[PDB]
Protein backbone atom coordinates (compact mmCIF):
# COMPACT_ATOMS: atom_id res chain seq x y z
CA UNK A 1 0.00 0.00 0.00
CA UNK A 2 0.84 3.77 -0.38
CA UNK A 3 2.53 6.45 1.77
CA UNK A 4 2.41 10.26 1.22
CA UNK A 5 5.65 12.14 0.71
CA UNK A 6 6.04 15.85 0.98
CA UNK A 7 8.60 18.30 -0.03
CA UNK A 8 11.28 19.27 2.50
CA UNK A 9 14.06 21.40 0.88
CA UNK A 10 14.00 20.25 -2.64
CA UNK A 11 14.29 16.71 -1.24
CA UNK A 12 10.75 15.49 -1.53
CA UNK A 13 11.23 12.45 0.56
CA UNK A 14 9.69 12.79 3.92
CA UNK A 15 6.85 10.57 5.07
CA UNK A 16 5.12 9.49 8.20
CA UNK A 17 5.87 6.22 10.03
CA UNK A 18 4.76 5.01 13.48
CA UNK A 19 6.47 3.28 16.41
CA UNK A 20 4.81 1.17 19.08
CA UNK A 21 1.21 0.17 19.95
CA UNK A 22 0.05 3.77 20.25
CA UNK A 23 0.54 6.62 17.67
CA UNK A 24 4.23 7.54 17.72
CA UNK A 25 4.75 9.68 14.68
CA UNK A 26 8.07 10.53 13.04
CA UNK A 27 8.88 12.42 9.94
CA UNK A 28 10.90 9.97 7.98
CA UNK A 29 13.49 10.19 5.43
CA UNK A 30 13.21 7.04 3.42
CA UNK A 31 16.73 6.40 2.58
CA UNK A 32 17.67 4.01 -0.03
CA UNK A 33 21.35 3.97 0.80
CA UNK A 34 21.21 3.68 4.47
CA UNK A 35 20.49 0.41 6.15
CA UNK A 36 19.15 0.75 9.66
CA UNK A 37 16.18 3.03 10.53
CA UNK A 38 16.61 5.31 13.53
CA UNK A 39 14.55 7.64 15.79
CA UNK A 40 15.05 10.60 18.18
CA UNK A 41 14.53 9.32 21.76
CA UNK A 42 12.57 11.06 24.52
CA UNK A 43 15.87 10.49 26.42
CA UNK A 44 17.78 12.15 23.53
CA UNK A 45 19.95 14.76 25.22
CA UNK A 46 21.22 16.63 22.27
CA UNK A 47 20.78 20.32 21.40
CA UNK A 48 18.47 19.90 18.26
CA UNK A 49 16.42 17.06 19.89
CA UNK A 50 14.41 19.90 21.47
CA UNK A 51 11.76 20.20 18.70
CA UNK A 52 11.90 16.88 16.89
CA UNK A 53 9.37 14.00 17.44
CA UNK A 54 10.25 11.62 20.31
CA UNK A 55 10.11 7.90 20.94
CA UNK A 56 8.92 6.99 24.39
CA UNK A 57 9.80 3.26 24.76
CA UNK A 58 7.83 3.09 27.95
CA UNK A 59 4.40 4.29 26.81
CA UNK A 60 4.46 1.69 24.05
CA UNK A 61 4.19 -1.73 25.70
CA UNK A 62 5.62 -3.67 22.78
CA UNK A 63 9.09 -2.37 23.66
CA UNK A 64 11.30 -5.46 23.34
CA UNK A 65 14.50 -4.22 25.17
CA UNK A 66 17.92 -4.55 23.55
CA UNK A 67 19.27 -1.36 25.14
CA UNK A 68 22.78 -2.06 23.65
CA UNK A 69 24.79 1.04 22.59
CA UNK A 70 25.25 1.93 18.85
CA UNK A 71 27.95 4.22 17.36
CA UNK A 72 26.58 5.48 14.06
CA UNK A 73 29.47 7.58 12.88
CA UNK A 74 28.24 8.77 9.51
CA UNK A 75 30.00 10.73 6.72
CA UNK A 76 28.80 14.18 8.00
CA UNK A 77 28.73 13.72 11.74
CA UNK A 78 27.79 11.31 14.44
CA UNK A 79 24.65 9.60 15.56
CA UNK A 80 24.75 7.41 18.70
CA UNK A 81 21.95 5.81 20.72
CA UNK A 82 20.70 2.46 21.92
CA UNK A 83 19.10 -0.35 19.99
CA UNK A 84 15.44 -0.89 20.65
CA UNK A 85 12.78 -3.36 19.40
CA UNK A 86 9.17 -2.57 18.71
CA UNK A 87 6.37 -2.51 16.22
CA UNK A 88 7.04 -0.24 13.19
CA UNK A 89 4.01 0.94 11.24
CA UNK A 90 3.63 2.23 7.76
CA UNK A 91 -0.01 2.62 6.88
CA UNK A 92 -1.49 -0.87 7.15
CA UNK A 93 1.88 -2.46 8.01
CA UNK A 94 3.23 -3.00 11.50
CA UNK A 95 5.73 -5.63 12.62
CA UNK A 96 8.39 -6.77 15.15
CA UNK A 97 11.35 -4.37 14.36
CA UNK A 98 14.89 -3.82 15.67
CA UNK A 99 15.67 -0.08 15.22
CA UNK A 100 17.84 2.71 16.87
CA UNK A 101 16.78 4.78 19.88
CA UNK A 102 18.80 7.88 19.32
CA UNK A 103 20.10 9.90 22.28
CA UNK A 104 22.84 11.99 20.68
CA UNK A 105 23.81 13.44 17.21
CA UNK A 106 26.38 15.91 16.39
CA UNK A 107 27.57 16.62 12.90
CA UNK A 108 24.33 16.51 11.00
CA UNK A 109 23.52 20.06 11.54
CA UNK A 110 23.08 22.76 10.16
CA UNK A 111 20.67 20.79 8.00
CA UNK A 112 18.83 18.71 10.47
CA UNK A 113 17.42 21.19 12.79
CA UNK A 114 16.04 23.51 10.20
CA UNK A 115 14.19 20.74 8.39
CA UNK A 116 11.11 18.98 9.57
CA UNK A 117 12.66 15.53 9.23
CA UNK A 118 12.92 13.54 12.46
CA UNK A 119 14.10 10.17 11.48
CA UNK A 120 16.06 8.27 8.92
CA UNK A 121 14.22 5.21 7.66
CA UNK A 122 16.90 2.87 6.34
CA UNK A 123 15.76 0.98 3.13
CA UNK A 124 19.04 -0.62 2.20
CA UNK A 125 20.96 -3.87 2.61
CA UNK A 126 22.20 -6.36 5.18
CA UNK A 127 25.95 -5.82 4.67
CA UNK A 128 25.49 -2.04 5.25
CA UNK A 129 23.37 -3.33 8.26
CA UNK A 130 25.38 -3.26 11.52
CA UNK A 131 23.47 -5.55 13.92
CA UNK A 132 23.45 -7.92 10.86
CA UNK A 133 19.60 -7.65 10.66
CA UNK A 134 17.42 -8.10 7.51
CA UNK A 135 15.63 -4.77 6.55
CA UNK A 136 12.09 -3.80 7.31
CA UNK A 137 11.22 -4.43 3.79
CA UNK A 138 12.63 -7.98 3.91
CA UNK A 139 10.93 -8.81 7.22
CA UNK A 140 7.45 -8.65 5.91
CA UNK A 141 7.54 -11.53 3.40
CA UNK A 142 9.52 -13.26 6.09
CA UNK A 143 6.72 -12.39 8.49
CA UNK A 144 3.68 -12.26 6.17
CA UNK A 145 1.94 -8.96 6.25
CA UNK A 146 2.58 -8.44 2.53
CA UNK A 147 3.40 -10.61 -0.46
CA UNK A 148 6.52 -9.43 -2.35
CA UNK A 149 9.55 -7.45 -1.09
CA UNK A 150 9.42 -4.36 -3.22
CA UNK A 151 9.16 -0.56 -3.04
CA UNK A 152 8.52 2.13 -5.39
CA UNK A 153 9.08 5.80 -5.10
CA UNK A 154 6.90 8.21 -7.00
CA UNK A 155 7.79 11.88 -7.30
CA UNK A 156 5.47 13.94 -9.40
CA UNK A 157 7.07 15.45 -12.59
CA UNK A 158 5.51 18.88 -11.96
CA UNK A 159 7.02 19.40 -8.41
CA UNK A 160 3.65 20.41 -7.02
CA UNK A 161 1.41 17.34 -6.14
CA UNK A 162 1.92 14.63 -3.57
CA UNK A 163 4.65 11.97 -3.88
CA UNK A 164 4.29 8.35 -2.94
CA UNK A 165 6.03 5.44 -1.71
CA UNK A 166 4.45 2.07 -2.17
CA UNK A 167 5.13 -1.26 -0.79
CA UNK A 168 3.37 -4.44 -2.11
CA UNK A 169 3.17 -4.46 -5.95
CA UNK A 170 4.30 -2.19 -8.87
CA UNK A 171 1.42 0.32 -8.89
CA UNK A 172 0.87 0.87 -12.59
CA UNK A 173 -0.87 4.27 -12.24
CA UNK A 174 2.60 5.77 -11.70
CA UNK A 175 4.80 4.86 -14.60
CA UNK A 176 4.50 5.26 -18.32
CA UNK A 177 5.76 2.93 -21.00
CA UNK A 178 7.50 -0.37 -20.12
CA UNK A 179 9.10 -0.62 -16.76
CA UNK A 180 12.81 -1.62 -16.83
CA UNK A 181 14.64 -3.66 -14.45
CA UNK A 182 18.31 -3.39 -14.06
CA UNK A 183 20.94 -5.65 -12.56
CA UNK A 184 22.62 -4.71 -9.27
CA UNK A 185 26.38 -4.93 -9.21
CA UNK A 186 26.50 -4.85 -5.36
CA UNK A 187 24.57 -6.43 -2.58
CA UNK A 188 25.54 -3.34 -0.54
CA UNK A 189 23.26 -0.68 -1.92
CA UNK A 190 20.79 -0.12 -4.73
CA UNK A 191 23.66 0.58 -7.26
CA UNK A 192 24.17 -0.55 -10.72
CA UNK A 193 26.89 -0.51 -13.25
CA UNK A 194 26.11 1.88 -16.09
CA UNK A 195 27.74 3.85 -18.87
CA UNK A 196 27.16 7.54 -18.47
CA UNK A 197 27.73 10.44 -20.88
CA UNK A 198 27.46 14.18 -20.76
CA UNK A 199 29.71 16.09 -23.16
CA UNK A 200 32.24 14.25 -25.17
CA UNK A 201 33.06 13.00 -21.76
CA UNK A 202 32.03 9.44 -20.98
CA UNK A 203 32.94 6.98 -18.31
CA UNK A 204 32.30 3.43 -19.57
CA UNK A 205 31.03 0.86 -16.93
CA UNK A 206 30.79 3.31 -14.06
CA UNK A 207 29.06 2.25 -10.87
CA UNK A 208 25.94 4.32 -9.94
CA UNK A 209 23.63 4.55 -6.97
CA UNK A 210 20.14 5.56 -6.44
CA UNK A 211 19.91 7.84 -3.45
CA UNK A 212 16.65 9.42 -2.20
CA UNK A 213 18.66 11.13 0.58
CA UNK A 214 20.52 13.28 -1.86
CA UNK A 215 19.15 16.25 -3.67
CA UNK A 216 21.52 16.46 -6.68
CA UNK A 217 22.94 14.33 -9.38
CA UNK A 218 26.55 13.44 -8.59
CA UNK A 219 29.37 12.93 -10.83
CA UNK A 220 33.04 12.28 -10.35
CA UNK A 221 35.10 15.39 -10.27
CA UNK A 222 37.20 15.06 -13.31
CA UNK A 223 34.10 14.06 -15.18
CA UNK A 224 32.73 17.32 -14.11
CA UNK A 225 35.58 19.63 -14.94
CA UNK A 226 36.11 18.26 -18.45
CA UNK A 227 32.95 19.58 -20.05
CA UNK A 228 32.41 22.20 -17.40
CA UNK A 229 35.69 23.98 -18.05
CA UNK A 230 34.50 25.43 -21.32
CA UNK A 231 30.87 24.86 -20.23
CA UNK A 232 30.89 28.44 -18.91
CA UNK A 233 29.47 28.15 -15.38
CA UNK A 234 30.09 29.99 -12.10
CA UNK A 235 30.24 29.67 -8.29
CA UNK A 236 29.53 30.93 -4.76
CA UNK A 237 33.39 31.37 -4.32
CA UNK A 238 35.05 28.29 -2.47
CA UNK A 239 31.48 27.07 -1.45
CA UNK A 240 29.77 24.34 -3.33
CA UNK A 241 27.10 25.98 -5.50
CA UNK A 242 27.24 26.17 -9.30
CA UNK A 243 25.52 28.36 -11.86
CA UNK A 244 24.50 29.33 -15.38
CA UNK A 245 21.68 30.52 -17.60
CA UNK A 246 18.27 28.97 -17.48
CA UNK A 247 18.18 29.78 -21.16
CA UNK A 248 21.24 27.61 -21.89
CA UNK A 249 21.89 25.68 -25.20
CA UNK A 250 25.56 24.40 -24.72
CA UNK A 251 24.22 22.01 -22.21
CA UNK A 252 24.12 18.26 -22.74
CA UNK A 253 21.60 15.62 -21.77
CA UNK A 254 22.58 13.43 -18.89
CA UNK A 255 22.81 10.22 -20.64
CA UNK A 256 22.65 7.13 -18.35
CA UNK A 257 23.05 4.08 -20.74
CA UNK A 258 22.60 0.30 -20.31
CA UNK A 259 22.15 -2.73 -22.54
CA UNK A 260 18.35 -2.31 -22.17
CA UNK A 261 17.20 1.34 -22.12
CA UNK A 262 18.92 4.65 -21.68
CA UNK A 263 17.94 7.13 -19.02
CA UNK A 264 18.38 10.62 -20.08
CA UNK A 265 18.26 13.84 -18.29
CA UNK A 266 17.60 16.97 -20.21
CA UNK A 267 19.12 20.29 -19.29
CA UNK A 268 15.65 21.42 -18.38
CA UNK A 269 15.65 18.83 -15.65
CA UNK A 270 18.89 19.42 -13.65
CA UNK A 271 18.67 23.12 -13.50
CA UNK A 272 16.66 25.21 -11.07
CA UNK A 273 15.88 28.94 -11.60
CA UNK A 274 16.86 31.43 -8.91
CA UNK A 275 15.03 34.78 -9.34
CA UNK A 276 11.87 32.62 -8.56
CA UNK A 277 9.34 33.06 -11.54
CA UNK A 278 10.76 34.77 -14.83
CA UNK A 279 14.47 34.20 -13.85
CA UNK A 280 17.44 34.31 -16.14
CA UNK A 281 19.44 32.19 -13.69
CA UNK A 282 19.82 28.58 -12.78
CA UNK A 283 21.74 26.20 -10.52
CA UNK A 284 22.69 22.70 -11.69
CA UNK A 285 21.90 19.81 -9.57
CA UNK A 286 25.15 18.46 -10.21
CA UNK A 287 27.93 18.54 -7.77
CA UNK A 288 31.27 16.96 -8.43
CA UNK A 289 32.18 14.27 -5.95
CA UNK A 290 34.50 11.20 -5.72
CA UNK A 291 32.63 9.00 -3.25
CA UNK A 292 34.61 6.08 -4.49
CA UNK A 293 35.58 4.58 -7.78
CA UNK A 294 33.76 5.89 -10.81
CA UNK A 295 30.80 6.49 -8.66
CA UNK A 296 27.92 8.55 -9.78
CA UNK A 297 24.87 9.17 -7.73
CA UNK A 298 21.25 9.72 -8.64
CA UNK A 299 19.20 11.73 -6.15
CA UNK A 300 15.99 13.63 -6.19
CA UNK A 301 16.07 15.31 -9.59
CA UNK A 302 16.43 11.84 -11.07
CA UNK A 303 13.59 10.35 -9.24
CA UNK A 304 11.76 13.50 -10.22
CA UNK A 305 11.55 12.12 -13.82
CA UNK A 306 12.16 8.50 -13.72
CA UNK A 307 9.82 6.54 -11.45
CA UNK A 308 11.93 4.12 -9.44
CA UNK A 309 11.22 0.77 -8.01
CA UNK A 310 13.27 -1.35 -5.75
CA UNK A 311 13.19 -5.20 -5.75
CA UNK A 312 14.79 -7.32 -3.06
CA UNK A 313 12.91 -10.29 -4.48
CA UNK A 314 14.71 -9.78 -7.78
CA UNK A 315 17.88 -7.81 -6.95
CA UNK A 316 16.36 -5.54 -9.63
CA UNK A 317 15.56 -1.81 -9.96
CA UNK A 318 12.56 -0.10 -11.38
CA UNK A 319 12.87 2.43 -14.17
CA UNK A 320 10.17 4.19 -16.02
CA UNK A 321 8.84 7.65 -16.57
CA UNK A 322 6.15 9.32 -14.36
CA UNK A 323 2.38 10.34 -14.50
Amino acid sequence: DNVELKDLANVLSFGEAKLGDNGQKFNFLFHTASSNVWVPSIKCTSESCESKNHYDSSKSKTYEKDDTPVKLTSKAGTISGIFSKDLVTIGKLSVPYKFIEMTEIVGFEPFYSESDVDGVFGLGWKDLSIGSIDPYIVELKTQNKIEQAVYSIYLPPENKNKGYLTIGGIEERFFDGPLNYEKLNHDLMWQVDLDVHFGNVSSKKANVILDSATSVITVPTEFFNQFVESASVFKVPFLSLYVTTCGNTKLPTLEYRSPNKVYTLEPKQYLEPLENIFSALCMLNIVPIDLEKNTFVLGDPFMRKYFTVYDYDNHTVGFALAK
Binding site: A9, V11, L29, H31, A33, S34, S74, K75, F111, V120, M189, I209, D211, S212, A213, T214, S215, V216, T218, S240, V287, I289, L291, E292, T295, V297
Partner: peptide
Protein backbone atom coordinates in the same frame (compact mmCIF):
# COMPACT_ATOMS: atom_id res chain seq x y z
CA UNK B 1 23.47 20.13 -1.06
CA UNK B 2 22.11 17.32 1.21
CA UNK B 3 24.37 14.50 0.27
CA UNK B 4 23.93 11.44 2.34
CA UNK B 5 27.78 6.80 0.66
CA UNK B 6 31.62 7.09 1.46
Amino acid sequence: XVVXAX
